[PDB]
C-alpha cells in the first residue's frame, strides 16, 4: 500500500509539580507530525504554533465557553485524574530483582565482564554502582541505560570491565525509591 | 515535573484507524477498544481501582476524524512523511535454560502509527501466547509499540522480531539467541 496517509493527532497534557500544588495543562493539536495550535494554561488562550493553526486559535479563542472549560482544566481534569489513579501510579513501588553473573567482552576471552542485572522495578529512577573489596569502581563501567519494558516495569544491566583475581569479591549496589537502604549483591571469583 | 499524565488520540486516513489512550510517566494506563467500544486497562488490577466511560473517547475520535478532514483540505492534501522505526529485541529478565522468560520487541520512533509485527521461532511465524500494546506517545510525537512472546529458553531455538513499516524498503528483523 503506497497510498498517501493523513494523520490527525492530539494530546491533553497534565504536568504536576510538588504533588498537585503546582499544575500546568497543555492541549496540543497536530497534523502529520506538525503541531499547529495549542492551549497553555500559563497563557489562558489558544495560540497558533504554525500559520496552518491560526484559523483555529482565532476561532477557538472566540468561544468563551470553550476557553473557560480549558481554564478550569487544571482542577476539573488534571487534579481530578491525578487523584483518581494516585494509589496505583504515583504510589506504585516495585522492588528490583538484583543478580550478578560473569560475561565476556568477546568470545575466546576469559571472564572479563561482570554484569549486574537490575530488573522488574518501578518507578524508573535507579542508581547502580560497582565496588571491589569495599572500594567503588568508577572506571570501565558500561550500561544499557534505563530500559522500559512497556508494562509498568523497568530494567537495566550495569557492567564492569575487569580482570578478576583469585579471592576478589565484587559488589553491586542498588538504590531505588522502593527501599530506604541500598541493596547489595556479591560475586566471587573462583 | 514530578509526574505527567497525557491523554493521546489520533485518527488516520485512509486506514480509518483511531486510538485513544492515557499515559502516566511513559506507561499506558488504559486505551479504548474502538471495535468493542470498551475500556482496556494496561494492568488488569487497574480496573478494580478506577473506571472510565469509553463513550467519551468515541466522541473525541469523531472530532479527530472531523478535524482530519478539515486539515487535509487546508494543507492541500500533503501526505505524512514516513519515519521508519528502530527495533530492539530483549528479554525482561536474564535468561536461564528451561526457565520461563519473555521476549520483548520494542518498536520505536516511527510514524504513521501502522506496523506489521511477526514473531519468528527458527524462521517460522509463532502466535501462541503473543501479546502487544497499542501505539504509545513520545515527546517528539513519533510512536512506540511493544510486542511480547513468552518462551522456554533453549540452546536449539532462535528468535526474530520481524517489523514491516511503509518507511522501510524491506522488513526489519531483530534477532535473539541464547548467549554463552
Amino acid at each position: 500500500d503506497t497510498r498517501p496517509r493523513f494523520l490527525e493527532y492530539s494530546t491533553s497534557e497534565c504536568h504536576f509539580f510538588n504533588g498537585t500544588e503546582r499544575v500546568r495543562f497543555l492541549e496540543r493539536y497536530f497534523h502529520n507530525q506538525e503541531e499547529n495550535v495549542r492551549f497553555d494554561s500559563d497563557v489562558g488562550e489558544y495560540r497558533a504554533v504554525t500559520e496552518l493553526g491560526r484559523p483555529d486559535a482565532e476561532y477557538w479563542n472566540s468561544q468563551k465557553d470553550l476557553l473557560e472549560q480549558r481554564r478550569a482544566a487544571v482542577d476539573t481534569y488534571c487534579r481530578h485524574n491525578y487523584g483518581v489513579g494516585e494509589s496505583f501510579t504515583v504510589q506504585r513501588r516495585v522492588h528490583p530483582k538484583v543478580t550478578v553473573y560473569p560475561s565476556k567482552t568477546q568470545p575466546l576471552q576469559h571472564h572479563n565482564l561482570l554484569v549486574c542485572s537490575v530488573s522488574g522495578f518501578y518507578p524508573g529512577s535507579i542508581e547502580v554502582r560497582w565496588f571491589r573489596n569495599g572500594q567503588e569502581e568508577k572506571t570501565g563501567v558500561v550500561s544499557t541505560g534505563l530500559i522500559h519494558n512497556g508494562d509498568w516495569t523497568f530494567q537495566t544491566l550495569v557492567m564492569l570491565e575487569t580482570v578478576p583475581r583469585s579471592g576478589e569479591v565484587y559488589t553491586c549496589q542498588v538504590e531505588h525509591p522502593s527501599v530506604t537502604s541500598p541493596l547489595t549483591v556479591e560475586w566471587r571469583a573462583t | 515535573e514530578e509526574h505527567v499524565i497525557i491523554q493521546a488520540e489520533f485518527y488516520l486516513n485512509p486506514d480509518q484507524s483511531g486510538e485513544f489512550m492515557f499515559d502516566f510517566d511513559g506507561d499506558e494506563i488504559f486505551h479504548v477498544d474502538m471495535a468493542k467500544k470498551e475500556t482496556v486497562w494496561r494492568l488488569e488490577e487497574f480496573g478494580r481501582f478506577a473506571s472510565f466511560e469509553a463513550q467519551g473517547a468515541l466522541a473525541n475520535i469523531a472530532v479527530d476524524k472531523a478535524n482530519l478532514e478539515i486539515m487535509t483540505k487546508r494543507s492541500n492534501y500533503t501526505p505524512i512523511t514516513n519515519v521508519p522505526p528502530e527495533v530492539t529485541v530483549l528479554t525482561n529478565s536474564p535468561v536461564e535454560l528451561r526457565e520461563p522468560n519473555v521476549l520483548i520487541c520494542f518498536i520505536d520512533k516511527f510514524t504513521p502509527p501502522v506496523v506489521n509485527v511477526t514473531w519468528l521461532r527458527n524462521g517460522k511465524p509463532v502466535t501462541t501466547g503473543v501479546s502487544e500494546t497499542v501505539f504509545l506517545p513520545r515527546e517528539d510525537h513519533l510512536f512506540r509499540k511493544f510486542h511480547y512472546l513468552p518462551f522456554l529458553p533453549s540452546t536449539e531455538d532462535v528468535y526474530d522480531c520481524r517489523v514491516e513499516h511503509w518507511g522501510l524498503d524491506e522488513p526489519l528483523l531483530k534477532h535473539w539467541e541464547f548467549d554463552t
Binding site: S10, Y29, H80, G85 | Q7, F30, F49, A50, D64
Partner: peptide, 13 residues
C-alpha cells in the same frame, strides 16, 4: 474514581 476525558475542539471548517 472515574477518569475524565478533555473533550476535543472541532477546527474551523
Amino acid at each position: 474514581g472515574v477518569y475524565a476525558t478533555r473533550s476535543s475542539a472541532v477546527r474551523l471548517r
